[PDB]
UniProtKB/Swiss-Prot annotation, chain A:
GO terms for cellular component: ribonucleoprotein complex; ribosome. The lineage of its organism: Eukaryota, Sar, Alveolata, Ciliophora, Intramacronucleata. Keywords: Ribonucleoprotein, Ribosomal protein, RNA-binding. It comes from Tetrahymena thermophila (strain SB210). Belongs to the eukaryotic ribosomal protein eL22 family. This is Large ribosomal subunit protein eL22. The gene is RPL22.
Curated annotation (Swiss-Prot), chain B:
The keyword Translocase does not apply. Belongs to the eukaryotic ribosomal protein eL34 family. Keywords: Ribonucleoprotein, Ribosomal protein. It holds the Pfam family Ribosomal_L34e. This is Large ribosomal subunit protein eL34. GO terms for biological process: translation. GO terms for molecular function: structural constituent of ribosome. Gene3D superfamilies: 6.20.340.10, 6.20.370.70.
UniProtKB/Swiss-Prot annotation, chain C:
Disulfide bonds: none annotated. GO terms for biological process: protein-RNA complex assembly; translation. It comes from Tetrahymena thermophila (strain SB210). This is Large ribosomal subunit protein eL38. GO terms for cellular component: cytosolic large ribosomal subunit. The gene is RPL38. Keywords: Ribonucleoprotein, Ribosomal protein. It holds the Pfam family Ribosomal_L38e. Belongs to the eukaryotic ribosomal protein eL38 family. One of its GO terms (molecular function) is structural constituent of ribosome.
UniProtKB/Swiss-Prot annotation, chain D:
InterPro entries: Ribosomal_eL39, Ribosomal_eL39_CS, Ribosomal_eL39_dom_sf. It holds the Pfam family Ribosomal_L39. The gene is RPL39. GO terms for cellular component: cytosolic large ribosomal subunit. This is Large ribosomal subunit protein eL39. GO terms for molecular function: structural constituent of ribosome.
Length: 100, 108, 66, 51
RNA sequence: UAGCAAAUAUUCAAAUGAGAACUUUGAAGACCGAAGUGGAGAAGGGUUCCAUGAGAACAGCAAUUGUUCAUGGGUUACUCGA
RNA sequence: AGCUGGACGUGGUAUAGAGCGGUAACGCAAAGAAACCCGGAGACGUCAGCAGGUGUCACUGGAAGAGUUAUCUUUUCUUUUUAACAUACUAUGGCCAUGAAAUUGGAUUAUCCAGAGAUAUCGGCUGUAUGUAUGGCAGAGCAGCUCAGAGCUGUCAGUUGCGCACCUGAUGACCCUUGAAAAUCUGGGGGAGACAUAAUUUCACGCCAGUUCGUACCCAUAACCGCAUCAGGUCUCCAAGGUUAGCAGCCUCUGGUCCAUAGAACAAUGUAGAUAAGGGAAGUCGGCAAAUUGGAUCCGUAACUUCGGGAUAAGGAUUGGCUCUGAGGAUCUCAGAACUGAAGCGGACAAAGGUAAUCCGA
């Protein structure tokens, strides 16, 4: 058992009304898998929303790798991927960006 | 899969031409030329053929580079003979002279 | 390249054109003497030995830091 | 190949120099019939003797 | 005229040029498939290597391209080998 | 970083003759020497299996990047490196003690060893790394991200293999075969000489030098030889994934390549490739050519014989997919059962057609 947490910095897109923190949140809750479950968000895992960021905390072992995966899928669903790219801002955080 | 190149202009595989694959800090896999193994040092007496202890097994050159220790041992024939052969030598010499004197007194 | 465990021999070597190269790593620090046929490294863990050796830098030897 | 005698090197050098074309200004001399260097040689079509 | 038919294969756009099926970039489709169409040597070759330039000839069609022509430049060792 | 040859400097070993420790194997920066005589290494075959290491390949958690995202995919790929050299430790064997073994033991996959001293001791000594740790070393290399040449981040921690190539270690088998030499480095036995302000000494650290020649490039379906840019010929090393007995074939990644004048038509004849209802060599000098056969597992297997063989003799079956069950091991093989298909399943690739006689030559 460990305390892990990860910060997804969604700052840029909110400002232009591209991302909606609200829906990204729901998305993440949906696609997060425990032991093969889409829904058991069982208490060990926690998700928070802010205006600019999302936070994931877990007792159960986790890797931001997964976060990047999910995020990407989200971006492809929203067709934003030719605009946005996720990157590693810090050890514990992944930031979104526009290119050009 | 990385492949190598001889570095010596001798492409033929000869006991003296052996190569070993080394992995460098560069990430390269490089041929490095490996040297030849040599036979351990044996006691010199007839039919004995014992592996000497406490002497280094070294390629002939490096023998000029080592410390006196590896070149030697502390017995009467330190380098040349093993203990058993030393011992049997001692004994034989002593007893032989004894028989010699005995023959001498029996002659006089 | 030789490395030294006991500060004494190291200090005999830097007491013996002499310059001393100190370099920082996260967990450790290293002190480095240049001599004709050998490059002497000296590593320490704790800051005490560290500062103590930084003190030890004589007027004869100039200290370079990377 | 790689390995060569001196003799070789020198000979090769020689033939290498001798293989230049007639210098364009020699054709302007008053007493010459020489349009070109008749003795030029091409490694592929003709081989030297070195052994 | 015989003939230029072995070794699976090429295609699209741009650029360069008097001229492009045969040159250069990119985009596609296939091959050798680590017993190679890969990376390096010995023998043999001797400058064929590198760069820039290019009329004819040669590269059995072609060429703006070259193993060809012209000009310049390249081969450093106590530890490799002799 | 190492090596050889120089030449002294500063420290240190040793001796009024010439280190010290251990019972012993043996040990330790150093511890006097000529003729002379003996050594060790150099210094070696073929094959078979075993063990280990390197490189490679595979897998696991972490991190950065990239591919896919209508659907599914905590996903798929990529990087995640460590030179010679220094010090210390471990390494398939051999030795030294102590004690001797019969209700003989020990031990390998195999051999094989022992009172000519086995086994066994909180025993000990020694030899070999392409091993481990640290130095080298991160400052380099690699992967990402910024800034307008400078900058920042990470390069981490594990597991397994009758896998593969090479090397090493300990063995085994073989010969009416028994598998170079010298230069070179080094050790032993011997103690003639040399020497008091002395003499000599395989310790450290420092000072000096390393000359001459070859180093480009091709090594081939275009740099060689074949009158050539010839479908021939020409000695080597490095080797990835999948299938598999497999370095076969077939398909892939790294790296390379599309070069072989082109376009269109589609007759005869041809070169190469296939398939033919019914019959089955009637064709033909002739079964020439083609066809059949082909893996693996289970059955079954004659005469003849020099008893080795014949032998995949001949012949008869099975082979996919899927869902379960049991057995062999450490601190990947084998067997059962059930269900399901156009009764197909070595689905490509790979891959014997048999039998009975006669003649030669063993
Ligand atoms: Mg980017
Ligand atoms: Mg040096
Ligand atoms: Mg030659
Ligand atoms: Mg020729
Ligand atoms: Mg000729
Ligand atoms: Mg023809
Ligand atoms: Mg080709
Ligand atoms: Mg080649
Ligand atoms: Mg090449
Ligand atoms: Mg010296
Ligand atoms: Mg042998
Ligand atoms: Mg991983
Ligand atoms: Mg042992
Ligand atoms: Mg760095
Ligand atoms: Mg093995
Ligand atoms: Mg081989
Ligand atoms: Mg023999
Ligand atoms: Mg002696
Ligand atoms: Mg040819
Ligand atoms: Mg045509
Ligand atoms: Mg028919
Ligand atoms: Mg029939
Ligand atoms: Mg029929
Ligand atoms: Mg036939
Ligand atoms: Mg039988
Ligand atoms: Mg059968
Ligand atoms: Mg038969
Ligand atoms: Mg079945
Ligand atoms: Mg069954
Ligand atoms: Mg069935
Ligand atoms: Mg079939
Ligand atoms: Mg027949
Ligand atoms: Mg015959
Ligand atoms: Zn002996």
């Amino acid at each position: 058992k460990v305390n892990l947490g990860f910060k997804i910095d969604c700052s840029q897109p909110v400002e232009d009304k591209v991302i909606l923190i609200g829906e990204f949140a729901e998305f993440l809750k949906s696609k997060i898998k425990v032991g093969g479950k889409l829904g058991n968000l069982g208490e060990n895992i926690t998700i928070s929303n802010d205006d600019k960021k999302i936070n994931v905390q877990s007792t159960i072992p986790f890797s931001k790798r997964y976060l990047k995966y999910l995020t990407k899928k989200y971006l492809k669903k929203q067709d934003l991927r030719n605009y946005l790219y996720v990157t590693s801002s810090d050890k514990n955080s992944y930031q979104l960006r526009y290119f050009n | 899969a990385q492949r190598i190149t001889y570095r010596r202009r001798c492409s033929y595989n000869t006991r003296s031409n052996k190569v070993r694959k080394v992995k460098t800090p560069g990430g390269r896999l490089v041929a490095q030329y490996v040297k030849k193994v040599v036979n351990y040092t044996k006691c010199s007496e007839a039919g004995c053929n014992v592996a000497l202890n406490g002497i280094a097994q070294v390629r002939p050159a490096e023998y000029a580079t080592i410390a006196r220790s590896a070149k030697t041992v502390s017995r009467v024939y330190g380098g040349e003979l093993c203990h058993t052969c030393v011992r049997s030598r001692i004994i034989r010499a002593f007893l032989t002279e004894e028989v010699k004197i005995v023959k001498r007194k029996m002659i006089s | 390249p030789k490395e030294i465990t006991d500060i004494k021999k190291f200090m005999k070597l830097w007491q013996n054109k002499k310059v001393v190269y100190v370099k920082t790593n996260k967990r450790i620090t290293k002190f480095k003497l240049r001599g004709k046929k050998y490059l002497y490294t000296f590593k320490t863990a704790d800051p005490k030995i560290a500062k103590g050796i930084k003190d030890a830098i004589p007027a004869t030897y100039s200290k370079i830091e990377i | 190949g790689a390995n060569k005698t001196l003799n070789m090197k020198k000979r090769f050098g020689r033939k290498i120099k001798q293989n230049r074309p007639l210098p364009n200004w020699y054709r302007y001399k008053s007493d010459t019939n020489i349009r070109y260097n008749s003795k030029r040689r091409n490694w592929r079509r003709t081989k030297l003797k070195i052994y």
